[PDB]
Amino acid sequence: SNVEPVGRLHIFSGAHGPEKDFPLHLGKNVVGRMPDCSVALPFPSISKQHAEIEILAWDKAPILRDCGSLNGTQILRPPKVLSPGVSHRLRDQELILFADLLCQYHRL
């Protein structure tokens, strides 16, 4: 197909199982437990619709928003707890927690 990834979300391996890599595309990339999510994370602590990474351009910082998750979305180095709907701009190599799951965003 035609869509070209403009980013990558890495889900670290751990107690929940092996690592995963998800391509991120222009527009809205939904993170959640639903199999239809752009970034599907089939784990009990992840909300059905957990967060959204919106990418407007390959060379502009994405927008991360929590979608009213139960267990939260957080940014590390330094710690930051995201309020539902509020824009957070992602930097290259950003470490993100969706609930208890550690992830890392990469520019391509």
């Binding site: 009990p44 602590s45 059905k48 998750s69 139960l70």
Partner: peptide, 8 residues
Amino acid sequence: MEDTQAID
């Protein structure tokens, strides 16, 4: 799908 499980 079932409800999200709170971290306890």
